[PDB]
């Protein structure tokens, strides 16, 4: 349907242990394709996807040039920030960055993203209009004011629309097998007593792609979100995904409950009943 490609960069200082550590990973949708690591011995962009291993070495070279360029950018980004906020070098601080782009079912551009976060909170980030910056605190205004005056927002918008998209366009051909497939969940219920007057009802979804999904419990058709347990969606590690939600019920009123699953690989959503 719609599609996405994002690049995620984590850098971390280790004050005693030398240089900061830089980790970056490619993703199309919920499929990962490449990775790069400051501490790896390869020092190249390595493929994480079978359909991306086919690219020429002049592809790999140029990509690993640009990621290496980012890495030192962020290492100096970490120095600037310790300076800006006046934290002591003894502390270990973290700088996360993401950028990428979204396309419609025909493949035209939809949205685009360029953003950084310092110590798990937002530092700077590009607005949806792609003409301005949102800057949380008085530090990021300085970087805003650097990047406004230096015309950064113009140059990234040209990347995001021109480049970011065209690659996602080829990747989705290249990976037609995996990338564009969609997998319905295999679903079922399990029943796990606790006391003699109570039982636990768990509704499962297994082996689905993409990972966006909605699990729902109800009684008599009325919605039960109150007493419901629901776990975070977990990668099955084969490339598919897994999730479950569960409720506690008075025994024996169980068939009075319905579990409702919605996923993009489902022509019509389902209903499970015990």
């Amino acid at each position: 349907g719609s599609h996405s490609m994002r690049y995620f960069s984590t850098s971390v200082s280790r004050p005693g242990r030398g240089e900061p550590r830089f980790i970056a990973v490619g993703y199309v949708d919920d499929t990962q394709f490449v990775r790069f690591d400051s501490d790896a011995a390869s020092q190249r962009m390595e493929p994480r996807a079978p359909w991306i291993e086919q690219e020429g070495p002049e592809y790999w070279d140029e990509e690993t040039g640009k990621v290496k360029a980012h890495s030192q950018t962020d290492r100096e980004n970490l120095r600037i920030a310790l300076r800006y906020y006046n934290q002591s070098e003894a502390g270990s601080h973290t700088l996360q960055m993401m950028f990428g782009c979204d396309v419609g079912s025909d493949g035209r551009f939809l949205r685009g993203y360029h953003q950084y976060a310092y110590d798990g909170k937002d530092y700077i980030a590009l607005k949806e209009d792609l003409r301005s910056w949102t800057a949380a605190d008085m530090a990021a205004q300085i970087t805003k004011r650097k990047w406004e005056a230096a015309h950064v927002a113009e140059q990234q918008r040209a990347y995001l629309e021109g480049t970011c998209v065209d690659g996602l366009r080829r990747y989705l051909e290249n990976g037609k097998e995996t990338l564009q497939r969609t997998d319905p969940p295999k679903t079922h219920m399990t029943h796990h007593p606790i006391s003699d007057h109570e039982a636990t009802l768990r509704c499962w979804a297994l082996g689905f792609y993409p990972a966006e999904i909605t699990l729902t419990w109800q009684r008599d058709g009325e919605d039960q979100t109150q007493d419901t347990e629901l776990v975070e969606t977990r990668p099955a590690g084969d490339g598919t995904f897994q999730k479950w939600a569960a409720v506690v019920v008075p025994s024996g009123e169980e068939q009075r409950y319905t579990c409702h699953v919605q996923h993009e690989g489902l022509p019509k959503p389902l209903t499970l009943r015990w």
Binding site: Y7, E63, K66, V67, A69, H70, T73, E76, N77, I80, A81, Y84, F99, H114, I142, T143, K146, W147, A150, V152, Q155, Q156, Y159, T163, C164, D166, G167
Partner: peptide, 11 residues
């Protein structure tokens, strides 16, 4: 295809 900022912009 990764961001190439030409000449790169730090803070």
């Amino acid at each position: 295809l990764y961001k190439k900022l030409k000449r790169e912009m730090t803070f």
